[PDB]
From Swiss-Prot, chains A, B:
It is found in: Lysosome. Keywords: Disulfide bond, Glycoprotein, Hydrolase, Lysosome, Protease, Signal, Thiol protease, Zymogen. Inhibited by CST6. One of its GO terms (cellular component) is lysosomal lumen. Glycans are attached at residues 109, 180. It is an enzyme of class 3 (hydrolase). Belongs to the peptidase C1 family. Predominantly expressed in the thymus and testis. Also expressed in corneal epithelium, and to a lesser extent in conjunctival epithelium and skin. Disulfide bonds join 23-66, 57-99, 158-211. It catalyses: The recombinant enzyme hydrolyzes proteins (serum albumin, collagen) and synthetic substrates (Z-Phe-Arg-NHMec > Z-Leu-Arg-NHMec > Z-Val-Arg-NHMec). The active site is at residues 26, 165, 189. This is Cathepsin L2. Its EC number is 3.4.22.43.
């Protein structure tokens, strides 16, 4: 069956933590983080991808740059657009700018995306175990999240339905010796390495889809 | 000529913070951290390596498993053995066990190791700026280290000669406005994320080889 724990950062699928700064673009960081892992699975090369390309160019697909967006609409843009530029060639400035997509600088493609069944944490565990990092949405609107530092995050006021922040599940695990209790999702944030635990947070797992991590998960098909 | 600050975590050289638990294997975590950084430099792939393989198998080279050892004897074993297994293939259980090395699971190799000039922090600063993370030993035998939480660690009773703990220097920097004062070494520990500053500590730099950080530094040759 599935592994008791998974951590794709230990296999080379994940880039160093980034910082979206004062721009509502976490959906773009979540999408590039999922496509970075799928392109690494496919080619063996880890290449940081451009959030700014997504902020500036995916309005036609329904995103609104620094005003918000959705990872599935980003993967739809990369498919429709035929590519996505590297972080190095199309740098992040955290403000809406003119679309400067350059095909010659493209280092990634996708044909669409796969959705995890909504609200199903075991479907998400299977996707994380067999595919690589997965884009998810969560309810991050709490000071307990803003000031998180360590341990398993559990917020009684969390919603599993009304979400406001895109993040990336890079694995799952458990504390202690028993693999079926005190479980958690390993989640990469885009608030810089200085936030949380080196930029990451353990979110309580199999506790009624806490903070909505399994409500709107998806990954690009490469 | 040398950079005023360096942080290899930003360039993809460093795996997540690990936890040796109740086993005197810090020398093994220091060694795998250095070899993870040199293999990434060589291949572009960051892959977690097996501390358990070093604990269980390097007795011939003079290591003593959970009862202590040396990063240099670890690099010697990888050279004599012709390989070192991935953590994924050879998981860590924090106890001394029978060697289970399998060459088919090897993901790393080295031809020996290089020693930094002893006691010379400027030689250590140069190796850190030009090679990547460096294995070092330090005097961690004070309660102030066990309870460290943030800031620049300075322990008046520290020794630079009698060292008892292997750690990994991943960079260096300074607090405040100018580069010449309040300098520190950026150190990755192996006591899990919950210890210290999310598993890391800043040790005073250019304060007379504080805690012995430059006394016994080295890195594998890949
Ligand atoms: Cl979405
Ligand atoms: Cl040593």
């Amino acid at each position: 069956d599935l592994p008791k724990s998974v951590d794709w950062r230990k296999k080379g699928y994940v880039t160093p933590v980034k910082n979206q700064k004062q721009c509502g673009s976490a959906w773009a960081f979540s999408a590039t983080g999922a496509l970075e892992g799928q392109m690494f699975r496919k080619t063996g090369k880890l290449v940081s991808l451009s959030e700014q390309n997504l902020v500036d160019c995916s309005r036609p697909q329904g995103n609104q740059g620094c005003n918000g967006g959705f990872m599935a609409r980003a993967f739809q843009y990369v498919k429709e657009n035929g590519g996505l530029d590297s972080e190095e060639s199309y740098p992040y400035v955290a403000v809406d700018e003119i679309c400067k997509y350059r095909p010659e600088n493209s280092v990634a493609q996708d044909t669409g995306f796969t959705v995890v069944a909504p609200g199903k944490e075991k479907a998400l565990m299977k996707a994380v175990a067999t595919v690589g990092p997965i884009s998810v949405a969560m309810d991050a609107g709490h000071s307990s999240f803003q000031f998180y530092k360590s341990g398993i995050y559990f917020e009684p006021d969390c919603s599993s339905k009304n979400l406001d922040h895109g993040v990336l599940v890079v694995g799952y695990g458990f504390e202690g010796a028993n693999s079926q209790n005190s479980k958690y999702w390993l989640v990469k944030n885009s608030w810089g390495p200085e936030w949380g635990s080196n930029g990451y947070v353990k979110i309580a797992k199999d506790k009624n889809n806490h903070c909505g991590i399994a409500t709107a998960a998806s990954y690009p098909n490469v």
